[PDB]
From a paper:
Many Gram-negative bacteria use a multi-protein type II secretion system (T2SS) to secrete a wide variety of exoproteins from the periplasm into the extra-cellular milieu. The T2SSs are composed of 12 to 15 different proteins that form three distinct subassemblies: (i) the inner membrane platform consisting of multiple copies each of GspC, GspF, GspL and GspM with an associated cytoplasmic secretion ATPase; (ii) the pseudopilus, a filamentous arrangement of multiple copies of five different pseudopilins; and (iii) a large, pore-forming outer membrane complex, mainly consisting of the secretin GspD. The inner membrane protein GspC consists of several domains: a short N-terminal cytoplasmic domain that is followed by the single transmembrane helix, a Pro-rich linker, the so-called homology region (HR) domain in the periplasm, a second linker and a C-terminal domain. Here, we studied the interaction between the outer membrane pore of the type II secretion system, the secretin GspD, and the inner membrane protein GspC.
The LBT to GspDN0-N1 facilitated crystal growth and the resultant crystals of the binary GspCHR–GspDN0-N1 complex diffracted to better than 2.7 Å resolution, with the LBT engaged in multiple crystal contacts. The structure of this binary GspCHR–GspDN0-N1 complex was solved by molecular replacement and refined with good crystallographic and stereochemical statistics. In the 2.63 Å resolution binary complex, the LBT introduced into GspDN0 faces away from the interface with GspC. The HR domain folds into a β-sandwich formed by six consecutive β-strands arranged as two three-stranded anti-parallel β-sheets. In its folded structure as seen in the complex with GspDN0-N1, the distribution of charges on the surface of GspCHR is quite uneven with the main hydrophobic surface interacting with GspDN0. The interface between GspCHR and GspDN0 buries 1280 Å2 of accessible surface area with a calculated ΔG of interaction of −5.4 kcal×mol−1 as assessed by the PISA server. A total of 18 residues from GspCHR and 19 residues from GspDN0 engage in a combination of hydrophobic interactions and hydrogen bonds. The first three β strands of GspCHR and the first β strand plus the subsequent helix α1 of GspDN0 are the major contributors to the interface. The majority of the hydrogen bonds are formed by an antiparallel arrangement of strand β1 of GspCHR and strand β1 of GspDN0. The interface and relative orientation of the N0 and N1 subdomains, however, is essentially the same in the two structures despite the binding of either Nb7 or the presence of the LBT insertion into the N0 domain: the superposition of the two N0 domains results in an r.m.s. deviation of 0.49 Å for 72 Cα pairs.
Residue numbers in the entry:
A (entry chain D): 3 to 70, 699 to 713, 74 to 80, 99 to 165
B (entry chain C): 122 to 186
Write the structure that this text describes.
Amino acid sequence: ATFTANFKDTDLKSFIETVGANLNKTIIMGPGVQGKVSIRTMTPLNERQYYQLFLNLLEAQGYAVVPMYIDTNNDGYIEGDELVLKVVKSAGDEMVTKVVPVRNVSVRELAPILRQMIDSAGSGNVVNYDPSNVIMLTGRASVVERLTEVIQRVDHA
Amino acid sequence: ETRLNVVLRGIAFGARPGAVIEEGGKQQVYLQGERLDSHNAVIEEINRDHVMLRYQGKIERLSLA
Ligand SMILES: [Ca+2]
Ligand SMILES: [Cl-]
């Protein structure tokens, strides 16, 4: 099960509200959530990766997501599908997101290289290491392309 | 294409899709089967890069800006 998305100049509040619908999750919004969001999925994402995208895009704007476990039926069980989320103030430039499989190496091995690249690329660019041995990249497309080539070079080298 | 003066600003596609559609500078999120708020138009299909509208008994495409 996967998510693709293309958002151009979208009100933050409307972005947030869409992710909630996609994920089937109640999102509660703090006061003064405002701003603009743009993103495009170069590859499909699965639910975790999409949620990570979410976290990534809100963070760029200065907004943190806080998960809350609420028991709406007083049964003493809070099932995963019923987590609530609270949002609150904490061409080569296109905002894109991509999943890169890594076939021959543990992904965490690549950290100290990518750490250097992201520090240099500057803010808005984020690498996420998935436990299934794939790296997720969010940031400016030129940067995402330069990370993708370094990931793949090291993989097949 | 749709002749309605509304702009498709975002599209998130999956099992539970949604579109952000603008009208009069106001953005609003729509799920499939919901009606357009401004005009009597039904988001009949949300697909990957576009929306199909039912307006006055015709199907019309709304693509991304
Ligand atoms: Ca319960
Ligand atoms: Cl509770």
